[PDB]
Amino acid sequence: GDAPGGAHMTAQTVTGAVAAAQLGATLPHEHVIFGYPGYAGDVTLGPFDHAAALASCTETARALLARGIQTVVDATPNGCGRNPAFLREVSEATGLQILCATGFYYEGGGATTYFKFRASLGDAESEIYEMMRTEVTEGIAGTGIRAGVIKLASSRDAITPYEQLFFRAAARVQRETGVPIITHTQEGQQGPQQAELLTSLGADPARIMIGHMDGNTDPAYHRETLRHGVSIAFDRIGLQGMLGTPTDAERLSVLTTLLGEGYADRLLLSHDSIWHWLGRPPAIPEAALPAVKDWHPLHISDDILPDLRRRGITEEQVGQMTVGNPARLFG
Template sequence: MFYEEVTDGIAGTGIKPGVIKVGSSRGVITEYEQMFFRQAARIQKETGIPIMTHTQEGTMGYEQIELLVAHGADPAKIVIGHMDGTTNIRDHLRVLERGVTIGFDRFGLEGLVGTPRDEERKATLLGLLAMGYEDQIILSHDTVNYWRGRRFPESDFMMKVLEKWHVSHLFEKILPDLQQSGVSVKTLNQIFTGNPSRVFKGQPISVKPL
């Protein structure tokens, strides 16, 4: 079924997906989750569609790559998502060494489900950029804009906690902060446009040794 959706379109609409999304739990890829990773890798091998993953608190990124590549996926077309859920630079380097792209995509989501503060995320990002990994990082915004059938956030308390978790936060706050920290327009253009374009074209990058 999934293969036909990629090649022929979803539910008879003729509309084809741009990516495959798979995810794993905190600290483990369950047997059930592994089934979807294997299927995603096989479909990518046959169709070339990029794969984007969900990590919980930035865990299991390396293991996700190992599983995907073992079943035929191309690292040049893999984005390991939510890696800004961890500030452990070694976790990032271990993933980047495999030639994939990582997502810093949860700015504004602070203090919930183990998420770091934005200042910690920025420090980690700046460290990776200083080490020369601007060709393997994507900045985007993972946020819930509308939940059918219920209010989101569901309480005034959560509204306050999540007040920065919206699509404009990245451009109103994070982008200016990065520029003030010395990140060049050239580097930002690479992160925002060059790297996504490369992922969709499947062009490999030159992997830096650890």
């Protein structure tokens, strides 16, 4: 099949290097803690309770291990609450392996003023590149802990000029270090555009995962993205009807079709769940409860896989999505 080609570093988790064979069943896109841009300004009434967070994240970590999952890829952007040391605490406490990211969110849902300003005054792309390269090769914030992936995100109607600064920096770091790239796509769009842009900039398709692809329910769109040889992730499995997000019945309809067409080696599954919110905990209106009911990280192990198997998906295909694909993409 398609193996990563070029410069390569051993997978870096918040607790250090891990061999590809030691990754095991992996959730490729989750958030241990997360706060939307602006949460830190609500510090007075929404402070971070370290003790409660640690206890709650370590428990979720344990529940995961209980189900055979050994690794989690935390895709939290630098300004959305990323905290490598905390991730390290959870990991040293449970034995759950956690990789964290380096990257900023999409123009629409991130704090883009900082770099939009630096770009108007100077060379923001090379500044973003230096940040990503330092974080992947040396470490984040002096902690000595390195990012195991680069997180990229684009808007719905287009990969904006602000967003492309990050896409060009990452491609450079990716060619230089071979580090994986995972992405966020907004509202089921830009998947083909993201894969085309990244590969044309020289990023290795075997090290790219276009995310939130479950956000589109027309398989023509998934197939068009897959032609680029990149992997795609149905990664918000469990979040249903929440903000135009589809239902799981819709995601499985598309997923089985793709699996039916031989695409298992490029298909990955995650929930994009938040284990502990930063800021004031989410006030979820009764009427929106069914949309977040299955949005936690045990949902794929307990409800999705058994569902794919009973529908004819093979143990081998399930293993390809959950163990094989992650080992090669991140290992």
